[PDB]
Amino acid sequence: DHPFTSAPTFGDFGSNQQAMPLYRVEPVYPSRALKRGVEGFVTLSFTIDTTGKAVDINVVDANPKRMFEREAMQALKKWKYQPQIVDGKAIEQPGQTVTVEFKIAK
């Protein structure tokens, strides 16, 4: 592919087993919290309906204070999941949780 002239910034990775959509492979990083300096985390417990619908958005734990929790919350919602059962990520899971550490840019 020959997209518009651009390049990546930093490196990212996700070892933890969480439910990731097909439009947002990762949570939307904030602007202020990014320049802050703290590296909290985002833990949201939601259920993926068999029809590929992410609902019951309920946070269990996150940053030490209003930082990346907002974006993480709104993200899980705005996110879009498709009902496609494939080796690794399937559907129908009333107990799906996504926990990822937020590291400030270098």
What are the residue boundaries of the structural domains of the chain, listed by start? 1-106
Q: Is 43 helix (H, G, I), strand (E, B) or coil?
A: strand
Q: Rounded CA gap, 20 and 56, in Å?
A: 16
Under a CB-based contact definition with an 8 Å cutoff, are residues 59 and 43 in contact?
yes
Give the phi and the psi of residue 33 in degrees, each rounded to 5: -55, -30
Q: Using CA atoms in the order 51, 53, 56, 62, what is the torsion angle rounded to 10 degrees? A: 140
Under a CB-based contact definition with an 8 Å cutoff, are residues 63 and 38 in contact?
yes
Which stretches of 38-98 are DSSP H helices? Answer: 69-78
Q: Which CATH architecture has domain 1-106?
A: 2-Layer Sandwich (3.30)
* Residue 55 burial (C-beta neighbours within 10 Å; 0-12, 13-18, 19+): exposed
Pairing of strands 93-101, 53-62: unpaired
Pairing of strands 41-49, 93-101: antiparallel
